[PDB]
Design a protein around this ligand. Structure first.
Ligand SMILES: Cc1cccc([C@@H](C)c2cnc[nH]2)c1C
Length: 154
């Protein structure tokens, strides 16, 4: 019982782009660009579409960096999140009704205003490591249990 999602990080040598979400699931946190994969769509095509819809950016090369499963206790559907990175983009980030984008230096990542699991896996993403993760949540703030391991193949 799982639903496919994508999550894209625009990660350059000295900075990362994040979006402050205005509405819906994750509102009030800095997020990467992501959402549900559609019928007849590849996971990578879904990742490229979500980045354009949410940030206004066009991506060249996407790289697979991780897979994370999220459980919310009492909710039947697991989230199966496929995580990607890119450095090569075109366009300038667009502020919309849904998202306020900002660049962060890599020593100023706003973890206090991000999903709490990011403190565990974001440091692997920054050192170009690949990973498999599982996080069990109670509500949106409390991690009950987790596993996280580095892999050669996502
Ligand atoms: C839409 C979407 C896609 C992927 C993940 C997430 C959340 C659960 C998340 C967990 N840790 C970072 N973000 C959302 C909201």
């Amino acid at each position: 019982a799982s639903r496919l999602y994508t999550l894209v990080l625009v990660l350059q040598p000295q900075r990362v782009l994040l979006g402050m979400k205005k509405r819906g699931f994750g509102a009030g946190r800095w997020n990467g660009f992501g959402g549900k994969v559609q019928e007849g769509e590849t996971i990578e095509d879904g990742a490229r579409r979500e980045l354009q819809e949410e940030s206004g950016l066009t991506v060249d090369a996407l790289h697979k960096v991780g897979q994370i499963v999220f459980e919310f206790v009492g909710e039947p559907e697991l989230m199966d999140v496929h995580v990607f990175c890119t450095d090569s983009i075109q366009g300038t980030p667009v502020e919309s009704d849904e998202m306020r984008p900002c660049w962060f230096q890599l020593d100023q990542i706003p973890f206090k205003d991000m999903w709490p699991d990011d403190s565990y896996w974001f440091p692997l993403l920054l050192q170009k490591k690949k990973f498999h993760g599982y996080f069990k949540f109670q509500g949106q703030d409390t991690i009950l249990d987790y596993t996280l391991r580095e892999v050669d193949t996502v």
